[PDB]
């Protein structure tokens, strides 16, 4: 009750004010733990009340920070898990087959235990996601290869550190200005023994002619295979497409969102202009419009491969993955 309410309020305020969990996996774990706490603590008779309350909590969580899709992704995953559990315990996708062939009020005592067990299994699968993704590094990196990365991605870092145990290759890291987080990635990879280069975004095209493949992370994967990545990733994808350089996205399955690129102006995250133009400029700040978008939209035609904890896939298959994770009625939430 009070503990649950204060935990929810703290989570919402942390999302609204930023900071909190740097790791996306940590954010997913905290979201799942909070959802489990709501399921255990909150009182509900039938599954319909659970749907309504989880939907309200997820709506509040995503309204706190719409650019943080992992929270909504986990909320929809929990809703799908609850729906599947109810269908298994009570009963026995839209398609041409279903179209040709063709009630949550009922109550069950053991449904809650099954829901918690499924959520715990999901958490266990989430725990080993990074190792599962990194275990595929040797199948995609050959000897004396050149890899291009932008910003700081922990999944890509684990990928490269696992590949470096048996192969020698070069990694080029482009800083993601203004938050030049690529410097930390470069120094980490150098500490791991990999030979690394640090450069600004302005050189992304210039050196792309000498890059064998591009390995990047993302914040979100849309239903059509599009990316909500850090800013400057669209230019990197365009430069890779110019040279037909394969672009690999190493992203866990919990970053898949059933949304579509129809949404406008809430996609990119806009922050204080101080990052781009300092406050000490003076009077010219009065008449100059300064905008600092954090995220970028990447169309699916610029992506070659998705590597996740379940293996490799093409963007054209992303829809099927989206069909296996979320019910079509939970996209609106």
């Amino acid at each position: 009750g009070s503990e649950l309410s204060e935990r929810i309020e703290s989570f919402v305020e942390t999302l609204k004010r930023g900071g909190g969990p740097r790791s996306s996996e940590e954010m997913a774990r905290e979201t799942l733990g909070l959802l489990r706490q709501i399921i255990t603590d909150h009182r509900w008779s039938n599954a319909g009340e659970l749907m309504e309350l989880i939907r309200r909590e997820g709506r509040r969580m995503t309204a706190a920070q719409p650019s943080e899709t992992t929270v909504g992704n986990m909320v929809r995953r929990v809703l799908k898990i609850i729906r599947e559990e109810y269908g298994r315990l009570h009963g026995r996708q839209e398609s041409l087959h279903k179209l040709l062939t063709s009630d949550f009020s009922f109550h069950y005592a053991q449904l809650q235990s099954n829901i918690i067990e499924a959520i715990n299994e999901l958490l266990v699968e989430l725990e080993g996601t990074m190792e599962n993704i990194a275990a595929q590094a040797l199948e995609h990196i050959h000897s004396n290869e050149v890899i291009m990365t932008i910003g700081f991605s922990r999944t890509v870092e684990a990928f490269l550190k696992e590949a470096a145990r048996k192969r020698k290759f070069h990694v080029i890291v482009a800083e993601c200005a203004p938050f030049c987080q690529g410097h930390e990635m470069a120094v980490n990879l150098s500490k791991a023994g990999i030979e690394t280069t640090v450069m600004t975004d302005a050189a992304i095209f210039a050196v792309m002619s000498r890059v064998n493949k591009v390995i990047i992370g993302t914040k979100t994967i849309l239903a059509n295979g599009a990316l909500r990545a850090v800013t400057g990733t669209h230019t990197l994808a365009l430069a890779a497409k110019h040279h037909s350089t394969p672009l690999i996205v190493c992203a866990p399955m919990f970053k898949l969102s059933p949304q579509f690129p129809n949404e406008e102006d809430s996609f990119h995250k806009f922050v204080a202009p101080e990052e781009v133009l300092p406050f000490t400029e003076g009077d010219i700040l009065e008449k100059v419009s300064v905008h600092c978008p954090v995220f970028d939209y990447v169309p699916p035609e610029l992506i070659t491969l998705f590597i996740s904890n379940i293996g490799g896939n093409a963007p054209s298959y992303i829809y099927r993955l989206m069909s296996e994770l979320y019910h079509p009625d939970d996209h609106v939430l």
Partner: protein
């Protein structure tokens, strides 16, 4: 560490907002459809303050009613807000003397006015202050917060400009003065007698009006009954360096924002900065106050649109525009760099530039308003042109076929309003 407290002064004892502040207190003035005290409370809550005492004297009834209806008075708010009211308050020194008398603060509280807009985290400043208190045996008493700025910025009003002389290696304040109408700044040589090195004269500091104080600050305020303002305390403490040193230090931030809305120029500058997202995450679309009437959506060129706006055909919102819920805009209009409150009605073929419209304002067709300000439920008739730097207060109605002068302030109250008016400008 003990819980972090904060003393909030909801009374501006100066009267730089007359005659606007006659009806509504300055602490409740809407900057971007949100009152200044809301921004101050949000800033205090975000920085880790757990206890916040508010002191209000002038029109304390409305302030208390607004506070009890706000988010921070909910039982779920981590920052507890207490309201202390007394009609005998005349200055900040009186408030601090009352604080000392009632022993409200135990150690290391935050002193700030009720009209500050900031996103500053004082955790590093608090750590430095506490470390120097522990090392130097509580000799230090106060650390001021300053923002690295430029003298040419709009937020650097001439009245509030301050030049400081500090010790570089330890961030100790040695001299402090204002630059109101002075082309020459003088510094006593005694500071150089204190140290042969480290003395630096800084003019690139914008006074955020945030301080980290100690109970000894309240004790000194009680000892010296002549201390009315914070400047009085700073000057009296710095001039008497020979006896009872009680050093004052400073902290400078370069990536965060901090400002105080002390006049109309400051109001315009801070409103522009907030609309342009300089106080992120405190943005109009963030809706940091959980109220349904202030929700909106953000769009390219900094366009903020609330629920049920229904913008007319042919009208253009160029950039930096905020629209409240229920506001109706006519056709073939031109709004730019303006904030419009909820429930406003705007005619057709009207050009608003750098104006600020509060809730209830109705504007007739064909008007031209530039760099003006309209208060609650103000009215404007047809064929009216407002020159820059014009103010209409509290349901003032301006008649048709008149061009107002530049610095024309109009209010229902006769004396303070430069042109008393009811339904026109010609008598």
């Amino acid at each position: 560490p003990p819980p972090l407290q904060a003393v909030l002064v909801a009374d501006s004892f100066d009267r730089r907002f007359f005659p606007i502040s006659k009806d509504q207190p300055r602490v409740l003035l809407p900057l971007a459809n949100v009152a200044l005290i809301d921004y101050t409370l949000e800033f205090l809550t975000a920085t880790g303050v757990q206890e916040t005492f508010v002191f209000c004297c002038w029109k304390a009834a409305q302030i208390k009613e607004h506070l009890l209806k706000s988010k921070w008075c909910r039982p779920t708010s981590l920052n507890v807000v207490r309201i202390i009211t007394s009609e005998l308050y005349r200055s900040l020194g009186d408030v601090l003397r009352d604080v000392d008398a009632k022993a409200l603060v135990r150690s290391d509280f935050l002193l700030v006015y009720g009209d500050v807009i900031s996103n500053i985290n004082i955790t590093r400043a608090l750590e430095e202050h506490r470390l120097r208190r522990k090392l130097e045996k509580n000799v230090s008493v106060m650390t001021m917060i300053f923002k690295e700025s430029s003298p040419s910025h709009p937020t650097r009003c001439h009245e509030d400009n301050v030049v400081v002389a500090v010790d570089s290696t330890t961030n100790r304040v040695l001299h402090f003065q204002k630059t109101q109408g002075l082309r020459r700044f003088a510094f006593p040589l005694s500071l150089f007698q204190g140290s042969s090195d480290g003395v630096e004269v800084r003019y690139d500091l914008l006074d955020c009006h945030i301080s980290i104080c100690s109970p000894q600050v309240a004790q000194l305020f009680t000892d010296n009954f002549d201390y009315q303002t914070r400047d009085d305390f700073v000057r009296g403490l710095l001039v008497n360096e020979e006896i009872l040193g009680n050093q004052i230090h400073m902290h400078v931030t370069a990536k965060e924002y901090g400002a105080r809305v002390s006049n109309l120029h400051m109001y315009s500058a801070v409103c522009a900065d907030v609309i342009r997202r300089w106080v992120y995450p405190l943005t109009p679309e963030a809706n940091f106050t959980d109220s349904t009437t202030q929700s909106c959506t953000h769009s390219r060129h900094n366009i903020y649109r609330g629920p049920e706006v229904s913008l007319g055909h042919g009208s253009i919102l160029e950039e930096n525009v905020l629209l409240g819920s229920g506001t109706v805009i006519g056709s073939n209009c031109f709004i730019t760099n303006s904030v419009i409150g909820p429930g406003c009605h705007i005619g057709d073929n009207v050009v608003l530039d750098q104006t600020y419209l509060w809730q209830g304002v109705r504007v007739a067709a064909g008007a031209q308003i530039h760099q003006s300000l309209l208060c609650d439920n103000a009215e404007v008739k047809e064929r009216v042109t407002l020159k820059p730097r014009s103010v209409l207060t509290s349901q003032v109605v301006v008649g048709p076929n008149i061009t107002l002068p530049e610095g024309s302030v109009i209010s229902l109250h006769p004396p303070d309003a430069e042109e008393d008016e009811d339904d026109g400008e010609f008598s």
